[PDB]
Swiss-Prot record:
This is Heme-binding protein 1. It is found in: Cytoplasm. GO terms for molecular function: heme binding. Gene3D superfamilies: Regulatory factor, effector binding domain. The keyword Cytoplasm applies. Keywords: Cytoplasm. Forms a distorted beta-barrel structure, with two helices that are packed against the outer surface of the barrel. Porphyrins are expected to bind to a hydrophobic patch on the outer surface of the beta-barrel structure. One of its GO terms (cellular component) is cytosol.
Length: 184
């Protein structure tokens, strides 16, 4: 009668894929699912990330309204805003991507700083790469992602990019990463 499977997590619209070695792109339209996001201001991206991490982990750690102690972790992504001067604008918005099972029913935000917001309507270019990533690698991948998207009508708004990883990598913990550019 009803047909479902175990492999289903984020239905999105991928238009195509096809980049370069290491930096490979995919332009896709977002699920539109509800995610847990925290935005930090006043504090630089360095501080904002480390300050937002507690806020993300406290949510899945048990400080959620449903009292879920299931610490579920998939790659976490945060938006950064680079100015044309090369300097990042001090505003950082962390998006915590919720696993599919919890998309159907996510716990309510019991912390005022973390909000469950749904994001749809926009198209992103995502580059998936593997290896030991440092903070510079995210920037470099964004740089190369722009370089690879060169010659296309792809424009970006605020040149915003998102950096995805399971943890903030210093060296070994951060082997799978994503960088998302949003088309203007």
């Amino acid at each position: 009668n009803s047909l479902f499977g175990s492999v289903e997590t984020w239905p999105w619209q991928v238009l195509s894929t096809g980049g370069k070695e290491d930096v490979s792109y995919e332009e896709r339209a977002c699920e539109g699912g509800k995610f847990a996001t925290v935005e930090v201001t006043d504090k630089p991206v360095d501080e904002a990330l480390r300050e937002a991490m507690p806020k993300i982990m406290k949510y899945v750690g048990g400080t959620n309204d449903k009292g879920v102690g299931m610490g579920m972790t998939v790659p976490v992504s945060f938006a950064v805003f680079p100015n044309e001067d090369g300097s990042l604008q001090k505003k950082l918005k962390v998006w915590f991507r919720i696993p599919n099972q919890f998309q159907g029913s996510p716990p309510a935000p019991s912390d005022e700083s973390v909000k469950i917001e749904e994001r749809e309507g926009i198209t992103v270019y995502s580059t998936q790469f593997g290896g030991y990533a440092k903070e510079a690698d995210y920037v470099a991948h964004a740089t190369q992602l722009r370089t690879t998207l060169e010659g296309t009508p792809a424009t970006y708004q605020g040149d915003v990019y998102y950096c995805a990883g399971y943890d903030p990598p210093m060296k070994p913990y951060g082997r799978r990463n994503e960088v998302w550019l949003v088309k203007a």
